[PDB]
Design a protein around this ligand. Structure first.
Ligand SMILES: [Cd+2]
Ligand SMILES: [Cd+2]
Ligand SMILES: [Cd+2]
Ligand SMILES: [Cd+2]
Ligand SMILES: [Cd+2]
Ligand SMILES: [Cd+2]
Ligand SMILES: [Cd+2]
Ligand SMILES: [Cd+2]
Ligand SMILES: [Cd+2]
Length: 102
């Protein structure tokens, strides 16, 4: 009965939905290539763009994202740290939304 070794293509029915139901719980394998459940944290493919297009087309995530492309700029300057996190501006602000400067 087990002619196919379940390890990669052992996906679930929920993975063949439209929209895919795995957005609310994956029951497939880590060998899946479905864009619907191929996200991490919860980002659009727009956020995976280069350059990122969240602040160009539509930002889905929050300032919690380590992506300095769609996050809010910090108030620090070249050599002047404000929040005290250790950044000197948006360029070096790889922090979360915990910055009071946001
Ligand atoms: Cd899927
Ligand atoms: Cd899935
Ligand atoms: Cd799958
Ligand atoms: Cd993101
Ligand atoms: Cd982004
Ligand atoms: Cd974004
Ligand atoms: Cd700051
Ligand atoms: Cd700072
Ligand atoms: Cd920061």
């Amino acid at each position: 009965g087990s002619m196919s070794s379940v390890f990669g293509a052992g996906c679930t029915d929920t993975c063949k939905q439209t929209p895919c139901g795995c957005g609310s719980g994956c029951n497939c394998k880590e060998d899946c290539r479905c864009q619907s459940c191929k996200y991490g944290a919860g980002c659009t493919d727009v956020c995976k763009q280069t350059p990122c297009g969240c602040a160009t087309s539509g930002c889905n995530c929050t300032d919690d994202c380590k992506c300095q492309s769609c996050s809010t700029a910090c108030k620090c300057a070249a050599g002047s740290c404000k929040c005290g996190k250790g950044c000197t501006g948006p360029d070096s602000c790889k922090c979360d939304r915990s910055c009071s400067c946001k």
